[PDB]
Amino acid sequence: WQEDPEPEDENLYEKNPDSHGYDKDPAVDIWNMRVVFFFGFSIVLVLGSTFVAYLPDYRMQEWARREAERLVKYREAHGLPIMESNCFDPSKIQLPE
C-alpha cells in the first residue's frame, strides 16, 4: 500500500555548526535566541526580581509591626494588658438564655 517511507532524523548542527537550536535558517535562529534571552532573562527575570524585591510593603506586614509597637508602647505605659482574651467588648454581646 502506498505510504511514504519514514524520514531521517536531521541534525541541526550538520548544516549550521553555530545553530542555537531554534530554526533551520541561521538568521531566524539568532533572532529567536535573542528575544528569548533578552526578554526572558534581561527583562522578566532581572527587572521582575527587582520589582518584587521593592514591592511597597507586601500585605502591610511592615505596617503591622509599626502598629504593634505603637500599641505595646501605649498599653504598657497606661498599665493595660498588652492583649486580652476577648476580641469583642462583652458590653456589645448578649448571650442566650
Partner: protein, 63 residues
C-alpha cells in the same frame, strides 16, 4: 555549553549592571524617607506611606 553560559551571563548583566548602579545611586543620592507624624489636616497620598524611593515609585505608577 560554554557559549550558553557566556550568553546567559551577558544578558543577566546587560540589565543587571545598570540596575545595580541605578539602585546604588538612588540609595546614595536620594535615600530613604524619614518617618514623620501626619500634620494636622494633611492627607498624604497613598504612595507616601512607604519608605524606600523605589517602593514609593512603584506605588505612584502602577498600584
Amino acid at each position: 555549553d560554554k557559549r550558553f553560559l557566556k550568553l546567559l551571563r551577558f544578558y543577566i548583566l546587560l540589565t543587571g549592571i545598570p540596575v545595580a548602579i541605578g539602585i546604588t545611586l538612588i540609595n546614595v543620592f536620594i535615600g530613604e524617607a524619614e518617618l514623620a507624624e501626619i500634620p494636622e489636616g494633611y492627607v498624604p497620598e497613598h504612595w507616601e506611606y512607604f519608605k524606600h524611593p523605589i517602593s514609593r515609585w512603584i506605588a505612584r505608577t502602577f498600584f
